[PDB]
Ligand binder design. Structure first.
Ligand SMILES: *[C@@H]1O[C@H](CO)[C@@H](O[C@@H]2O[C@H](CO)[C@@H](O[C@@H]3O[C@H](CO[C@H]4O[C@H](CO)[C@@H](O)[C@H](O)[C@@H]4O)[C@@H](O)[C@H](O[C@H]4O[C@H](CO)[C@@H](O)[C@H](O)[C@@H]4O)[C@@H]3O)[C@H](O)[C@H]2NC(C)=O)[C@H](O)[C@H]1NC(C)=O
Ligand SMILES: *[C@@H]1O[C@H](CO)[C@@H](O)[C@H](O)[C@H]1NC(C)=O
Lengths: 50, 50
């Protein structure tokens, strides 16, 4: 009511209570993974000039 | 429907019988009472918009 004196009756009050919120991020399943291990666990490596 | 009252300056028409008619009248009185909130309608669960 923006006042220090409240008369008799029933009043509707705006929200002044503060609650804390967290952050939830959901993303799909990790799949079709990079075959970089095939780059890494190769028995022989690529040649210098090819 | 077209009507023509048989008017002359010595003739009158007097009813000899009656009827009792109970008719219906419908009147609105009040309507729906509604109430609104600022932050819940406009922004809604948003601190920076509030
Ligand atoms: C002034 O007006 C009033 C009413 O408007 C008359 O008073 C009586 O009216 C009733 C209803 O018309 C008469 O009763 C009987 O009506 C039967 C028809 O009934 C149908 O319609 C009524 C509504 O009007 C519905 O509620 C009902 O469900 C039916 O759908 C007739 O079939 C009757 O006729 C039988 O009886 C007479 C004797 O009375 C026989 O001669 C016939 O052959 C038949 O067997 C009957 O008419 C009632 O009779 C009226 N009273 C009198 C005293 O006649 C007034 O008559 C009228 N005039 C004056 C001067 O007051
Ligand atoms: C590649 O080597 C690493 C380390 O030993 C191992 O964890 C991984 O499973 C290997 N990948 C493949 C495809 O063999």
């Amino acid at each position: 009511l923006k006042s220090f004196t409240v008369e008799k009756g029933i009043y509707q009050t705006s929200n002044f209570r503060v609650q804390p919120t967290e952050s939830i991020v959901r993303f799909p399943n990790i799949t079709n993974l990079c075959p970089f291990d095939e780059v890494f666990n190769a028995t022989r490596f690529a040649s210098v000039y090819a | 429907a077209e009507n023509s009252v048989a008017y002359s300056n010595n003739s009158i028409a007097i009813p000899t019988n009656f009827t009792i008619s109970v008719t219906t009248e419908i009147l609105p009185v009040s309507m729906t009472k509604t109430s609104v909130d600022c932050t819940m309608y406009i922004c809604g669960d948003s601190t920076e918009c509030s």
